[PDB]
Design a protein around this ligand. Structure first.
Ligand code: HEC
Ligand code: HEC
Lengths: 89, 87
């Protein structure tokens, strides 16, 4: 596909899969990356995901000082794309 | 003392149990709060626990901007005390 989504998947594996492998949320099981959960909590957008990745929230760490702006844009795109695809395989 | 440990337990329930319930570690089972693990990684002290809680590490979030210094001292004392008596 696109370069952005591919790089987003690498940012995801290295920074997010520890808690969200395959769209899970092993820490807070009510707040997964499945589309229904993103929709329930108003997180089904690039800007909302970007805000939470940048600032952290609750038990989720912040990445705003550790990732580049492009890294965060790409990982947000990857999450939204995988969520729309049902985190298939 | 007893006051510190009691408040530490409340800070722990509100901020740490999501990942460390009963002294475990839902994200990385190799790095629990059990005495053997704290000893292995040099984390079996108020100073070490305070630092990690304040700064975060890896997938563990930082709490230094969200908790008072007293909150962090107390939760550190709680964790050390639980580890010594076995969670
Ligand atoms: C474990 C330490 C995590 C890391 C690593 C990542 N996330 Fe996370 N995420 C975690 C928690 C505990 C929560 C809920 C926070 C709360 O209190 O509300 C979240 C939530 C999200 C969400 C929203 C999910 C939803 O509302 O259903 C998103 C979109 C999200 N997380 C993305 C994300 C990214 C992109 C990560 C790597 C940069 C990442 N998380 C890491 C726990 C953890
Ligand atoms: C999930 C989002 C966590 C939250 C909430 C808390 N901790 Fe944590 N802890 C977590 C991880 C992923 C790790 C290992 C980090 C690494 O990469 O090395 C830890 C580690 C600790 C340790 C050291 C344990 C050991 O070395 O065996 C301690 C003492 C510790 N965590 C304490 C602690 C406190 C007091 C918390 C609430 C304020 C807390 N953690 C929350 C994951 C998560």
């Amino acid at each position: 596909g696109s370069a952005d989504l591919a790089h987003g998947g690498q940012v995801f594996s290295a920074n997010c899969a520890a808690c969200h492998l395959g769209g899970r949320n092993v820490v807070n099981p009510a707040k997964t990356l499945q589309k229904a959960d993103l929709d329930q909590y108003g997180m089904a957008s690039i800007e909302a995901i970007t805000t939470q990745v940048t600032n952290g929230k609750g038990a989720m760490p912040a990445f705003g000082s550790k990732l580049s702006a492009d890294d965060i844009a790409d990982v947000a795109s990857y999450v939204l794309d995988q969520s729309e695809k049902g985190w298939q395989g």
